[PDB]
Amino acid sequence: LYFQGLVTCFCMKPFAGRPMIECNECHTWIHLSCAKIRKSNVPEVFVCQKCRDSK
Ligand SMILES: [Zn+2]
Ligand SMILES: [Zn+2]
């Protein structure tokens, strides 16, 4: 049950045992649902919105 209360996603809500996905570039852990990813179609490579719009 580690990191249960840890907030890493941009939505400011904690892990809470919800499915997560890591940005391939900034290494931030984002909620799978916040990443707008359907559980039936999880990409090999995920890049968060912020990294996509870098600089
Ligand atoms: Zn989130
Ligand atoms: Zn990123």
Residue numbers in the entry: 227 to 281
How did the manuscript describe this experimental structure?
PHF13, also known as Survival time associated PHD finger in Ovarian Cancer 1 (SPOC1), is a chromatin affiliated protein that is conserved from zebra fish to humans. PHF13 has been shown to modulate various processes including development, DNA damage, cell cycle, antiviral host cell response and higher order chromatin structure, underlining its biological importance. PHF13 contains a single C-terminal PHD domain, which we demonstrate biochemically and structurally, is a molecular reader of H3K4me2/3. Similar to other PHD domains, the PHD domain of PHF13 folds into a canonical Cys4-His-Cys3 (or C4HC3) motif, that coordinates two zinc ions with a well-conserved globular domain.
